[PDB]
Design a protein around this ligand. Structure first.
Ligand SMILES: CCS(=O)(=O)N1CCC(C(=O)O)CC1
Ligand SMILES: CCS(=O)(=O)N1CCC(C(=O)O)CC1
Ligand SMILES: [Zn+2]
Length: 138
Protein backbone atom coordinates (compact mmCIF):
# COMPACT_ATOMS: atom_id res chain seq x y z
CA UNK A 1 0.00 0.00 0.00
CA UNK A 2 1.11 3.67 -0.15
CA UNK A 3 0.47 7.02 -1.86
CA UNK A 4 2.09 10.28 -3.03
CA UNK A 5 0.93 13.53 -1.34
CA UNK A 6 1.79 16.60 -3.49
CA UNK A 7 -0.10 19.91 -3.07
CA UNK A 8 -3.78 18.99 -2.55
CA UNK A 9 -3.46 15.63 -4.43
CA UNK A 10 -3.22 12.03 -3.25
CA UNK A 11 -1.78 9.66 -5.92
CA UNK A 12 -2.54 5.92 -5.39
CA UNK A 13 -2.64 2.67 -7.37
CA UNK A 14 -6.08 2.72 -9.10
CA UNK A 15 -6.71 -0.90 -7.91
CA UNK A 16 -6.15 0.23 -4.24
CA UNK A 17 -8.23 3.47 -4.40
CA UNK A 18 -10.81 3.80 -1.52
CA UNK A 19 -14.48 5.01 -1.77
CA UNK A 20 -13.19 8.42 -0.53
CA UNK A 21 -10.57 8.52 -3.37
CA UNK A 22 -13.42 7.96 -5.91
CA UNK A 23 -15.69 10.46 -4.04
CA UNK A 24 -12.85 13.09 -4.53
CA UNK A 25 -11.62 11.87 -8.01
CA UNK A 26 -9.39 14.44 -9.84
CA UNK A 27 -8.17 11.97 -12.53
CA UNK A 28 -7.90 8.21 -13.18
CA UNK A 29 -6.30 6.10 -15.97
CA UNK A 30 -7.10 2.31 -15.98
CA UNK A 31 -4.24 1.75 -18.54
CA UNK A 32 -1.70 3.38 -16.08
CA UNK A 33 -3.05 1.86 -12.78
CA UNK A 34 -3.25 5.51 -11.42
CA UNK A 35 -5.88 7.57 -9.58
CA UNK A 36 -5.49 11.09 -8.16
CA UNK A 37 -7.96 12.38 -5.53
CA UNK A 38 -8.19 15.85 -3.92
CA UNK A 39 -7.05 16.29 -0.28
CA UNK A 40 -8.01 19.22 2.06
CA UNK A 41 -4.54 19.15 3.76
CA UNK A 42 -1.34 20.20 1.86
CA UNK A 43 1.07 17.33 0.93
CA UNK A 44 4.89 17.62 1.30
CA UNK A 45 6.09 15.31 -1.64
CA UNK A 46 7.80 16.84 -4.73
CA UNK A 47 7.39 15.10 -8.16
CA UNK A 48 10.65 14.70 -10.16
CA UNK A 49 10.79 16.68 -13.45
CA UNK A 50 13.65 14.68 -15.05
CA UNK A 51 14.49 11.60 -17.17
CA UNK A 52 16.52 9.75 -14.47
CA UNK A 53 16.68 5.97 -15.02
CA UNK A 54 18.22 5.29 -11.58
CA UNK A 55 16.71 5.83 -8.10
CA UNK A 56 15.69 4.13 -4.81
CA UNK A 57 12.35 2.39 -4.12
CA UNK A 58 10.81 1.24 -0.85
CA UNK A 59 9.97 -2.53 -0.70
CA UNK A 60 7.50 -3.03 2.26
CA UNK A 61 7.81 -6.90 1.88
CA UNK A 62 11.56 -6.50 2.87
CA UNK A 63 11.13 -3.22 4.81
CA UNK A 64 14.15 -2.05 2.67
CA UNK A 65 14.94 0.72 0.15
CA UNK A 66 16.68 -0.68 -2.95
CA UNK A 67 18.66 1.30 -5.53
CA UNK A 68 17.53 0.26 -9.08
CA UNK A 69 18.10 0.97 -12.80
CA UNK A 70 14.68 1.27 -14.53
CA UNK A 71 13.47 1.37 -18.17
CA UNK A 72 11.84 4.57 -19.51
CA UNK A 73 7.99 4.69 -19.26
CA UNK A 74 6.45 2.35 -21.92
CA UNK A 75 3.52 0.05 -22.84
CA UNK A 76 4.27 -3.31 -21.11
CA UNK A 77 2.20 -6.56 -21.00
CA UNK A 78 1.97 -7.40 -17.20
CA UNK A 79 2.10 -11.15 -16.17
CA UNK A 80 -0.84 -12.61 -14.15
CA UNK A 81 -0.18 -12.90 -10.36
CA UNK A 82 -1.75 -15.02 -7.53
CA UNK A 83 -4.46 -12.30 -7.13
CA UNK A 84 -4.67 -10.18 -10.39
CA UNK A 85 -4.97 -11.29 -14.05
CA UNK A 86 -2.48 -10.46 -16.89
CA UNK A 87 -2.89 -7.10 -18.79
CA UNK A 88 -1.18 -4.31 -20.86
CA UNK A 89 -0.12 -1.16 -18.87
CA UNK A 90 1.08 2.23 -20.28
CA UNK A 91 3.67 4.59 -18.65
CA UNK A 92 5.21 1.54 -16.84
CA UNK A 93 8.94 1.33 -15.81
CA UNK A 94 10.61 -2.05 -15.06
CA UNK A 95 13.64 -2.80 -12.88
CA UNK A 96 15.20 -6.06 -11.59
CA UNK A 97 14.06 -6.10 -7.98
CA UNK A 98 11.67 -7.65 -5.42
CA UNK A 99 7.97 -6.83 -5.73
CA UNK A 100 5.18 -9.19 -4.47
CA UNK A 101 1.47 -8.54 -3.64
CA UNK A 102 1.46 -5.84 -0.90
CA UNK A 103 4.47 -3.89 -2.38
CA UNK A 104 2.22 -1.58 -4.54
CA UNK A 105 2.33 2.13 -3.51
CA UNK A 106 6.01 1.91 -2.60
CA UNK A 107 7.58 5.22 -3.84
CA UNK A 108 10.46 5.24 -6.36
CA UNK A 109 12.48 8.46 -6.13
CA UNK A 110 15.64 10.23 -7.41
CA UNK A 111 17.43 13.52 -6.38
CA UNK A 112 14.64 15.53 -8.17
CA UNK A 113 11.96 13.73 -6.09
CA UNK A 114 9.17 11.18 -6.66
CA UNK A 115 9.44 9.26 -9.99
CA UNK A 116 6.54 6.79 -9.53
CA UNK A 117 4.94 4.11 -7.31
CA UNK A 118 5.19 0.31 -7.37
CA UNK A 119 2.42 -1.18 -9.53
CA UNK A 120 3.71 -4.69 -10.60
CA UNK A 121 5.98 -7.55 -9.44
CA UNK A 122 6.75 -11.25 -10.13
CA UNK A 123 9.62 -12.96 -11.99
CA UNK A 124 12.44 -10.97 -10.22
CA UNK A 125 11.01 -7.67 -11.65
CA UNK A 126 9.31 -4.57 -10.13
CA UNK A 127 7.08 -2.34 -12.31
CA UNK A 128 6.58 1.34 -11.41
CA UNK A 129 3.78 3.63 -12.65
CA UNK A 130 5.55 6.82 -13.81
CA UNK A 131 3.98 10.13 -12.57
CA UNK A 132 6.70 12.59 -13.95
CA UNK A 133 4.66 13.47 -17.12
CA UNK A 134 1.75 14.68 -14.91
CA UNK A 135 3.00 18.32 -14.71
CA UNK A 136 -0.44 19.49 -13.40
CA UNK A 137 0.44 17.78 -10.02
CA UNK A 138 3.12 20.38 -8.91
C1 LIG B 1 2.92 -8.84 -7.50
C2 LIG B 1 2.11 -8.68 -8.74
S1 LIG B 1 0.34 -8.59 -8.44
O1 LIG B 1 -0.29 -8.29 -9.69
O2 LIG B 1 -0.09 -9.74 -7.72
N1 LIG B 1 0.09 -7.31 -7.47
C3 LIG B 1 1.05 -6.20 -7.31
C4 LIG B 1 0.91 -5.56 -5.94
C5 LIG B 1 -0.54 -5.11 -5.83
C6 LIG B 1 -0.92 -4.44 -4.55
O3 LIG B 1 -0.10 -4.61 -3.54
O4 LIG B 1 -1.95 -3.86 -4.49
C7 LIG B 1 -1.48 -6.29 -6.01
C8 LIG B 1 -0.72 -7.55 -6.28
C1 LIG C 1 18.66 8.52 -6.18
C2 LIG C 1 18.10 7.94 -4.90
S1 LIG C 1 17.35 9.15 -3.83
O1 LIG C 1 16.37 9.87 -4.57
O2 LIG C 1 16.95 8.50 -2.62
N1 LIG C 1 18.51 10.23 -3.42
C3 LIG C 1 19.84 10.20 -4.06
C4 LIG C 1 19.96 11.39 -5.00
C5 LIG C 1 20.13 12.66 -4.16
C6 LIG C 1 21.60 12.95 -3.94
O3 LIG C 1 22.25 11.93 -3.45
O4 LIG C 1 22.11 14.01 -4.22
C7 LIG C 1 19.34 12.50 -2.85
C8 LIG C 1 18.11 11.60 -3.03
ZN1 LIG D 1 15.52 12.55 -11.47
Amino acid sequence: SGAIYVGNYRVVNRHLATHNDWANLVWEDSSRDLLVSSTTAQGCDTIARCDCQTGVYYCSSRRKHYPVSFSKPSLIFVEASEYYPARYQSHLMLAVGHSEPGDCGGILRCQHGVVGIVSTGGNGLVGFADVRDLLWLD
